[PDB]
Design a protein around this ligand. Structure first.
Ligand SMILES: CNc1nc(OC2CCCC2)nc2c1ncn2Cc1c(F)cccc1F
Length: 269
């Protein structure tokens, strides 16, 4: 049953705390710290991991983690498991175990590519490949009817083989209808995707330069959208523009976008 399926997923998501060794602080996220970690595997060997540290709230976290561990796609970050520690004040410490991605997030990578020591200039073909990877991961989530709600270049991770995966599922990424009536659909994730494509095409630029966050709703209300980046193919601009059609029903699905992006990439010499 649906219940029996949730119970299984819960047993698989929990990791024994003793199988985990924590390292240095990598940074400070939203909820709290992200640390380096070692995870003891079933085959005797240890794996480098990243550990994000944050009754009903604990149960919601467990249920949500149980769902995510079940996601299985090369362009979706895999949730390795969760640990629940307890503070000296008796406050729960939910820990989420993720793979360590030495190349880090896509946003930083793009910015670094514009500096001498950072990765070399990213050719157009590679930038389109990044968009195709995100579209593939989002197409997978969308089919499973799972909404991301925070898609941006900062939440996409680069694997060792340069594959991008969506992870972590900010007014300038939010669709016009989600700013007006707080309603969020898969088409709202499509809008966020269009914005993400523009972050990639500008190589890390903040969306809507010269437009303040408080004036974002009225900017869009008047039909204005993100401008075409310099040396962005018209075909690529048309694809990202279609993500920002006023009516969510007119916006393409992730499947259609993915197919448009793959064809455009194929056409490149
Ligand atoms: C350099 N590689 C990594 N760096 C960071 O930095 C954290 C990010 C915020 C400051 C700390 N987190 C990593 C890394 N590889 C994996 N993760 C785990 C992780 C994600 F994959 C996606 C979103 C949040 C995450 F915590």
């Amino acid at each position: 049953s649906h219940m029996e399926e949730l119970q299984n997923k819960l047993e698989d998501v929990v990791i024994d705390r003793n199988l985990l060794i924590l390292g240095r602080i990598l940074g400070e996220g939203e909820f709290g710290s992200v640390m380096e970690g070692n995870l003891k595997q079933e085959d005797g060997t240890s794996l480098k991991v990243a550990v994000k540290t944050m009754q009903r709230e604990i149960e919601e976290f467990l249920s949500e983690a149980a769902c995510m561990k079940d996601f299985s796609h090369p362009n979706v970050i895999r949730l390795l498991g969760v640990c629940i520690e307890m503070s000296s004040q008796g406050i729960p410490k939910p820990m989420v175990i993720l793979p360590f991605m030495k190349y880090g997030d896509l946003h930083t990578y793009l910015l670094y590519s514009r500096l001498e020591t950072g990765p070399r200039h990213i050719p157009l073909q590679t930038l389109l490949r990044f968009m195709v990877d995100i579209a593939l991961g989002m197409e997978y989530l969308s089919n499973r009817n799972f909404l991301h709600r925070d898609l941006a270049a900062r939440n996409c991770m680069l694997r060792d083989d340069m594959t991008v995966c969506v992870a972590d599922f900010p007014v300038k990424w939010i669709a016009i209808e989600s700013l007006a009536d707080r309603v969020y659909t898969s088409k709202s994730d499509v809008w966020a995707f269009g914005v993400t494509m523009w972050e990639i095409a500008t190589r890390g630029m903040t969306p809507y330069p010269g437009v303040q966050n408080h004036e974002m709703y009225d900017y869009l209300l008047h039909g204005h959208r993100l401008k075409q980046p310099e040396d962005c193919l018209d075909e690529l601009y048309e694809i990202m523009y279609s993500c920002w059609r006023t009516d969510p029903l007119d916006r393409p699905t992730f499947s259609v976008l993915r197919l448009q992006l793959e064809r455009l990439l194929e056409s490149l010499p």
